[PDB]
């Protein structure tokens, strides 16, 4: 405890008062004097048709040329976005996959899912074909996302209410991050690769530290499970989209909310969120068969990225900002511009 | 096209390989095996031969069956049950001996699911002899206070079947029922002809004649 419960309650009241006293004004009251982006139309420059089942993940390469896609068909195929050609066709041990990753050096491809095993694939092998490099297995829940810190360290978000950092050299969990109550279903590493956040199913996103291994911040402003998350390119802000048909923007130093991207016409949830190079545009995937274009400073719909025949599962933006890719459930990977 | 012609040839070759793999894998039948804990899942999956998902596949009467016992996933169902669409049918196992409201709630939640609105559910009832002996020892109204009727084995079993079959609301999906006593080896034929019936129904629905 009763004393411990009261201590926790007064600590919550204290942190709430601290974050409330520093909120002089909202973002919408300070960006009023900027010119809106207007109608931002985009056209399907390329339509890549390679798969036969639902596509869940599609990550751009570091060179902004190769895109790797994942699907229930058990194939993780890397594609040449420029000329639509197929360069690899990697069969997977478990056909149930939910995420994929591309190494910053381009030598490694990761993919995991319900199998509870994060598989690491070696691309540039002297023997020709692609062979498995390691089978990381230390999670009791389904892996939901994977990101490569470098050629050795990889951070994975699992479905058993924790996130762990791996070492591909030995396959052992160097550091584990615990504290979430709901299922963690999203992950995004910082541009400086020194910290990251994880989106859980308890409507709470927590900042993390890869080196120290201790949680730094927590954010409680959602109503349902958080489905996607992505950092602002500046590295000091991030936006998370949930199943409550809205995506909100947070700030690391402010430890509060900035904007809520809610429209009365939209009722379906969020499946993917991604920014642009300048960070002005926030391309968000929706379960309403379309991907609304969200301005990050005025909270208005610049345009609709419609054209898919099923719900989109992943949206990614190239490192040079010249294209955006959307992966849907109709086995089509349309690359827009 | 100086050197990229060989790249085009490689792309076409692997596209042909993908087409062949898709054609080969389109012949399989996907059956999801759900239910409560220790309710005969292990004995039924071992009946037809052969850490998160335990996929068991076997061939019966020129038909390739695939079972995915996903009950071992200690997480929220709603976050990964959406990937189990396009299955021919859902196999549900109920342990009548041990009680009971959890199984009924799970069946209600799975039969009215948005993704499984059209997929049929095959209901399996196990431990017939134990349930009969328990009737011979105890009344069947312990977990059914609203029940009012004779304590006969057949009548009680029919009542339980009615409670399961009164949870559906979609005319398109039909629930198939069966009795098992953990000593019958003919349960494969029920799965087989249920799968054939569901195949016929889906084929008629696709062609527009249904």
């Amino acid at each position, epitope marked *: 405890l009763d004393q411990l419960r009261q201590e926790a309650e007064q600590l919550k009241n204290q942190i709430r008062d601290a974050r409330k006293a520093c909120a002089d004004a909202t973002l919408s009251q300070i960006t009023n004097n900027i010119d809106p982006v207007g109608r931002i139309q985009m056209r399907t420059r390329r339509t890549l048709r390679g798969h036969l089942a639902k596509i869940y993940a599609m990550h751009w390469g570091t060179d902004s040329r190769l895109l790797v896609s994942a699907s229930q068909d058990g194939k993780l195929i890397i594609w040449d976005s420029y000329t639509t050609n197929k*360069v690899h066709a990697i069969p997977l041990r478990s056909s149930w996959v939910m995420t994929c990753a591309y190494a910053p050096s381009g030598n490694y491809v990761a993919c995991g899912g319900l199998d509870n095993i994060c598989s690491i694939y070696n691309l540039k092998t002297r023997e020709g074909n692609v062979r498995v490099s390691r089978e990381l297995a230390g999670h009791t829940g389904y892996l939901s996302c994977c990101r490569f810190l470098d050629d050795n360290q990889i951070v994975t978000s699992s479905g058993d209410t924790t996130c762990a950092l791996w070492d591909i050299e030995t396959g052992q969990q160097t550091t584990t991050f615990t504290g979430h109550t709901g299922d963690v279903m999203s992950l995004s590493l910082a541009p400086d690769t020194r910290l990251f956040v994880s989106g859980a199913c308890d409507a709470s996103a927590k900042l993390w530290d890869v080196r120290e291994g201790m949680c730094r911040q927590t954010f409680t402003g959602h109503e349902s499970d958080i489905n996607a998350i992505c950092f602002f390119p500046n590295g000091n802000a991030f936006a998370t989209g949930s199943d409550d048909a809205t995506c909100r923007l947070f700030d690391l130093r402010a430890d509060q909310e900035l904007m809520t991207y809610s429209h009365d016409n939209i009722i379906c949830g969020i499946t993917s969120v991604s920014f642009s190079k300048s960070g002005r545009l926030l391309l968000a995937g929706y379960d309403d068969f379309n991907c609304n274009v969200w301005d990050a400073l005025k909270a208005d719909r610049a345009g609709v990225l419609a054209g898919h025949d099923n719900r989109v599962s992943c949206l990614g933006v190239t490192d040079d900002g010249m294209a955006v890719a959307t992966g849907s459930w109709d086995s089509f990977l349309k690359i827009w511009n | 096209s100086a050197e990229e012609r060989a790249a085009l040839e490689r792309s076409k070759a692997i596209e042909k390989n993908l087409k062949e793999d898709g054609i080969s894998a389109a012949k399989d039948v996907k059956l999801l095996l759900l239910g409560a804990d220790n309710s005969g899942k292990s004995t039924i999956v071992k009946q037809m031969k052969i850490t998160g998902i335990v996929e068991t596949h076997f061939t019966f009467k020129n038909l390739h069956f695939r079972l995915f016992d996903v009950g071992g996933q200690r997480s929220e169902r709603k976050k990964w049950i959406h990937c189990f669409e396009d299955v021919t049918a859902i196999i549900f196992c109920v342990d009548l001996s041990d009680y009971m409201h959890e199984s009924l709630m799970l069946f209600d939640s799975i039969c009215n699911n948005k993704f499984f609105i059209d997929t049929s559910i095959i209901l399996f009832l196990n431990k017939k002899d134990l349930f009969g002996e328990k009737i011979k020892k105890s009344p069947l109204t312990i977990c059914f206070p609203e029940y009012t009727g004779p304590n006969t084995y057949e009548d009680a079993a029919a009542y339980i079947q009615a409670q399961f079959e009164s949870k559906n609301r979609s005319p398109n999906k039909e629930i198939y029922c069966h009795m098992t006593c953990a000593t019958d080896t003919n349960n494969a034929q029920v799965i087989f002809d249920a799968v054939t019936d569901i195949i016929i129904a889906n084929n008629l629905r696709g062609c527009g004649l249904y």
Partner: single-chain antibody, 234 residues
Framework: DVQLVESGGGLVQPGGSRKLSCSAS????????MHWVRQAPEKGLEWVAY????????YYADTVKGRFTISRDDPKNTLFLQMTSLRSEDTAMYYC??????????????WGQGTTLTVSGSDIVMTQATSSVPVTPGESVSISCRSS???????????LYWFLQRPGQSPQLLIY???NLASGVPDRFSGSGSGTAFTLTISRLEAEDVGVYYC?????????FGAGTKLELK
């Protein structure tokens, strides 16, 4: 490990026929491509034949077309070369070369040991004026290779390979596509080129870098070699 071996080499009576076999092991041969290159006992290298992945397309040189036959037995993991009507100009050092073609691949990465056989117009021509450059270790030596037609393709890739053939050994790849470096080769080697003139800049020469160099173009078949530039001690 990766390794290539060839068999079926010996003196042949003039006007006869003989089969050549390239055996491969240690890698997935069914997905790769096998080339063929001859080397005269006094002159340099020369392109012979090709078969693509899956036996799709087969090419030949002008002076060998209509008399040879290149076939692949993928399950047997061997490369074949049927050659007939032995004239006096066919005696040379015949090598077997692996190649794979996709985005970012390195064709001609591995070369075979080679076999010995003894018998008693619009093509792009490769030329290099310097055929003997004496130099002591520790200095920087640059080797040139000029082109009759520009090798810069519309997509931005210049197909001007560089190869080094140590005495008593098989040729090895140093720089492919005139700008990208090989795998495992020391970082001292470098490449450059623009349109027609290409230079293979080398820094901090050592004793193991001696030999004779060869520059290849890859814009269109046949794949014509150069005369050869020799780097020697002192």
């Amino acid at each position: 490990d990766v390794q290539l071996v060839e068999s079926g080499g010996g003196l042949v009576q003039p006007g006869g026929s003989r089969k050549l076999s390239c055996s491969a092991s240690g890698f997935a041969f069914s997905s790769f491509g096998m080339h063929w290159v001859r080397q005269a006992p006094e002159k340099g290298l020369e392109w012979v034949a090709y078969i693509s992945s899956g036996s799709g397309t087969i090419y030949y040189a002008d002076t060998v077309k209509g008399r040879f036959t290149i076939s692949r037995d993928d399950p047997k993991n061997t490369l074949f070369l049927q050659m007939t009507s032995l004239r006096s100009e066919d005696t040379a050092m015949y090598y077997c070369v692996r190649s794979i073609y996709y985005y970012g691949s390195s064709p001609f990465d591995f070369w075979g040991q080679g076999t010995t056989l003894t018998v008693s117009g619009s093509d792009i021509v490769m030329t290099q004026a310097t055929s003997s450059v004496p130099v002591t270790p520790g200095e920087s030596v640059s080797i040139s290779c000029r082109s009759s037609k520009s090798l810069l393709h519309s997509n931005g890739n210049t197909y001007l390979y560089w190869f080094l053939q140590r005495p008593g050994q098989s040729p090895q790849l140093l720089i492919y596509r005139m700008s990208n470096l090989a795998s495992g080769v020391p970082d001292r080697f470098s490449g450059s080129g623009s349109g027609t003139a290409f230079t293979l800049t080398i820094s901090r020469l050592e004793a193991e870098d001696v030999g004779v160099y060869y520059c290849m173009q890859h814009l269109e078949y046949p794949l014509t070699f150069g005369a050869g530039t020799k780097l020697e001690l002192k």
